Structure 1
Amino acid sequence: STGSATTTPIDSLDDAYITPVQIGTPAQTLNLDFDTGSSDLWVFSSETTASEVDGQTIYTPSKSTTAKLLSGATWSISYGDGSSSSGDVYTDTVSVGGLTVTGQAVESAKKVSSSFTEDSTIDGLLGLAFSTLNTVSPTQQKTFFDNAKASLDSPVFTADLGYHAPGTYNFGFIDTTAYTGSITYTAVSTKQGFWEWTSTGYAVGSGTFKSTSIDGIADTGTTLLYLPATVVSAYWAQVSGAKSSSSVGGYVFPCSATLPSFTFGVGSARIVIPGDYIDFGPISTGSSSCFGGIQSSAGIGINIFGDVALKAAFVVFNGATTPTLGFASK
Structure 2
Amino acid sequence: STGSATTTPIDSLDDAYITPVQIGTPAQTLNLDFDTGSSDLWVFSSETTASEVDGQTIYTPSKSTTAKLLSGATWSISYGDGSSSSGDVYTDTVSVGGLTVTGQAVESAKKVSSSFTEDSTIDGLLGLAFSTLNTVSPTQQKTFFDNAKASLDSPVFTADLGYHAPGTYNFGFIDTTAYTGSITYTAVSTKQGFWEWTSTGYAVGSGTFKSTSIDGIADTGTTLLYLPATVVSAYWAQVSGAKSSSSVGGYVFPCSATLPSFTFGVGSARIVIPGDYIDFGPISTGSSSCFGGIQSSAGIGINIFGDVALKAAFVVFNGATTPTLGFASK
Q: TM-score, normalised by structure 1?
A: 1.00
Q: Following the alignment from structure 2 to structure 1, what is the Cα–Cα distance between the partners of residues 79 and 36?
A: 13
* Structure 1 segments unaligned to the other structure (5+ residues): none
Q: TM-score, normalised by structure 2?
A: 1.00
Q: Following the alignment from structure 2 to structure 1, what is the Cα–Cα distance between the partners of residues 33 and 327?
A: 21
CA displacement, residues 93-123 of structure 1 (integer Å, 9 cap, x when unaligned): 0000000000000000000000000000000
CA displacement, residues 8-33 of structure 1 (integer Å, 9 cap, x when unaligned): 00000000000000000000000000
Match of 2:251 in 1: 251
CA displacement, residues 161-185 of structure 1 (integer Å, 9 cap, x when unaligned): 0000000000000000000000000
Q: Following the alignment from structure 1 to structure 2, what is the Cα–Cα distance between the partners of residues 95 and 69?
A: 19
Q: Following the alignment from structure 1 to structure 2, what is the Cα–Cα distance between the partners of residues 286 and 146?
A: 45
Match of 1:82 in 2: 82
CA positional deviation for 1:310 = 0.0
Summarize the alignment of residues 192-203 of structure 1 with structure 2, pairs less than 5 Å apart: 192-203=192-203
Aligned length: 330
CA positional deviation for 1:154 = 0.1
Q: Following the alignment from structure 2 to structure 1, what is the Cα–Cα distance between the partners of residues 56 and 81?
A: 21
Q: Following the alignment from structure 2 to structure 1, what is the Cα–Cα distance between the partners of residues 33 and 319?
A: 20
Q: Following the alignment from structure 1 to structure 2, what is the Cα–Cα distance between the partners of residues 104 and 127?
A: 12
CA positional deviation for 1:275 = 0.1
CA positional deviation for 1:155 = 0.1
Q: Which consecutive segments of 4 or more residues in structure 1 shift more than 3 A?
A: none
Q: Following the alignment from structure 1 to structure 2, what is the Cα–Cα distance between the partners of residues 264 and 73?
A: 42
Q: Secondary structure at the match of 1:257?
A: coil
Summarize the alignment of residues 240-319 of structure 1 with structure 2, pairs less than 5 Å apart: 240-319=240-319
Match of 2:148 in 1: 148
Q: Following the alignment from structure 1 to structure 2, what is the Cα–Cα distance between the partners of residues 102 and 164?
A: 34
CA displacement, residues 225-279 of structure 1 (integer Å, 9 cap, x when unaligned): 0000000000000000000000000000000000000000000000000000000
Q: Secondary structure at the match of 2:191?
A: coil
Q: Following the alignment from structure 2 to structure 1, what is the Cα–Cα distance between the partners of residues 188 and 272?
A: 21
Q: Following the alignment from structure 1 to structure 2, what is the Cα–Cα distance between the partners of residues 319 and 327?
A: 15
Q: Following the alignment from structure 2 to structure 1, what is the Cα–Cα distance between the partners of residues 80 and 37?
A: 10
CA displacement, residues 54-92 of structure 1 (integer Å, 9 cap, x when unaligned): 000000000000000000000000001100000000000
Q: Following the alignment from structure 1 to structure 2, what is the Cα–Cα distance between the partners of residues 53 and 248?
A: 28
CA displacement, residues 160-215 of structure 1 (integer Å, 9 cap, x when unaligned): 00000000000000000000000000000000000000000000000000000000
Q: Following the alignment from structure 1 to structure 2, what is the Cα–Cα distance between the partners of residues 143 and 237?
A: 41
RMSD: 0.1
Q: Secondary structure at the match of 1:232?
A: helix
Q: Following the alignment from structure 2 to structure 1, what is the Cα–Cα distance between the partners of residues 139 and 171?
A: 26
Q: Following the alignment from structure 1 to structure 2, what is the Cα–Cα distance between the partners of residues 81 and 209?
A: 31
CA positional deviation for 1:301 = 0.1
CA positional deviation for 1:7 = 0.1
CA displacement, residues 132-162 of structure 1 (integer Å, 9 cap, x when unaligned): 0000000000000000000000000000000
CA positional deviation for 1:47 = 0.1
Q: Following the alignment from structure 2 to structure 1, what is the Cα–Cα distance between the partners of residues 210 and 92?
A: 49
Q: Secondary structure at the match of 2:276?
A: helix
Q: Secondary structure at the match of 1:191?
A: coil
Q: Secondary structure at the match of 1:115?
A: helix
Q: Following the alignment from structure 1 to structure 2, what is the Cα–Cα distance between the partners of residues 31 and 61?
A: 16
Q: Following the alignment from structure 1 to structure 2, what is the Cα–Cα distance between the partners of residues 129 and 328?
A: 20
Percent identity of paired positions between Structure 1 and Structure 2: 100
CA positional deviation for 1:2 = 0.1
Q: Following the alignment from structure 1 to structure 2, what is the Cα–Cα distance between the partners of residues 54 and 247?
A: 29
CA displacement, residues 268-322 of structure 1 (integer Å, 9 cap, x when unaligned): 0000000000000000000000000000000000000000000000000000000
Q: Following the alignment from structure 1 to structure 2, what is the Cα–Cα distance between the partners of residues 183 and 201?
A: 18
Match of 2:163 in 1: 163
Summarize the alignment of residues 61-100 of structure 1 with structure 2, pairs less than 5 Å apart: 61-100=61-100
